[PDB]
């Protein structure tokens, strides 16, 4: 409603995906770190991408 031509869809999708990736990695890393499992961020970022 604020932005019309693709800056509505482009920026909306960009903001949603950027926020989703941050929380998706945090939730997965939080589960494994609670169990003492050590996995690099690269491996999870490959899956989330």
């Amino acid at each position: 409603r604020i932005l019309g031509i693709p800056w509505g869809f482009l920026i909306g999708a960009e903001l949603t995906i950027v926020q989703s990736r941050i929380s998706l990695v945090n939730k997965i890393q939080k589960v494994y770190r609670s169990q003492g499992v050590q996995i690099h961020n690269r491996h999870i970022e490959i899956i989330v991408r």
Partner: protein, 102 residues
């Protein structure tokens, strides 16, 4: 394609649309845009909102056909039973679109 005109296109040529119909479509798409930006971006508010949308008991049966004669008595009955055989503008312009204006 049976039509030789469709030769060249991928999924046949565009369908025939008269210049009169194309102008009407462009008039409609413009006003659906104007109505959209009204809700996103007081007695004057309702009168323009209604204006944009407007740019789109046996006697009740008469609207299904052309209403030939009818009116006095039993004519409506005979016709219904025989019909089965065939079977503010100065304020609207104050808004402005900005499509393509980066």
């Amino acid at each position: 394609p049976l039509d030789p005109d469709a030769a060249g296109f991928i999924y046949s040529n565009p369908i025939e649309t008269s210049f009169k119909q194309r102008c009407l479509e462009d008039w409609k798409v413009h006003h659906r845009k104007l109505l959209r930006t009204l809700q996103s971006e007081e007695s004057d508010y309702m009168r323009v909102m209604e204006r944009l949308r407007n740019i789109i008991e046996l006697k009740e049966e008469l609207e299904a056909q052309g209403l030939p004669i009818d009116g006095t008595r039993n004519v409506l009955y005979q016709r219904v039973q025989k019909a089965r055989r065939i079977n503010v503008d100065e304020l609207i312009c104050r808004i402005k679109l900005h499509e393509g204006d980066t």
